[PDB]
UniProtKB/Swiss-Prot annotation:
This is Streptavidin. Coiled coil: none annotated. Homotetramer. The keyword Hydrolase does not apply. It is found in: Secreted. Biotin binds at Y32, Y43, W81, V97, W109. One of its GO terms (cellular component) is extracellular region. Its main location: secreted. The biological function of streptavidin is not known. Forms a strong non-covalent specific complex with biotin (one molecule of biotin per subunit of streptavidin). Residues 2-123 form the Avidin-like domain. Keywords: Biotin, Secreted, Signal. A motif (Cell attachment site) lies at residues 48-50.
Amino acid sequence: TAEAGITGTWYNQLGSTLIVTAGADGALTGTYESAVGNAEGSYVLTGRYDSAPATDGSGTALGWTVAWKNNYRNAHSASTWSGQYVGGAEARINTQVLTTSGTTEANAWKSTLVGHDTFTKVK
């Protein structure tokens, strides 16, 4: 199931660690530790996934958010990852990521980064 496949620890191409629990009805909850940027220690993660995905070979749509504030740091920023889980022996979460920083209205045009993150079950 996607519930069983998503739940656990994932690692990205930059050295970051996702620890997530997928709930039976579509909740994603957990923590994120980024290896880059204005971040240190773990941050709360919340999101949603399709808890009844297609059975035709398609991936399982999901997304989550992290606000970059914890006890050690506040980067006045939040990232959202949007993507799909692909199961099996070489399981992946393939994502596109938006990172928005709080800005003045004048600087809003440079508020949001776009990137892409690929997560695997092994480091």
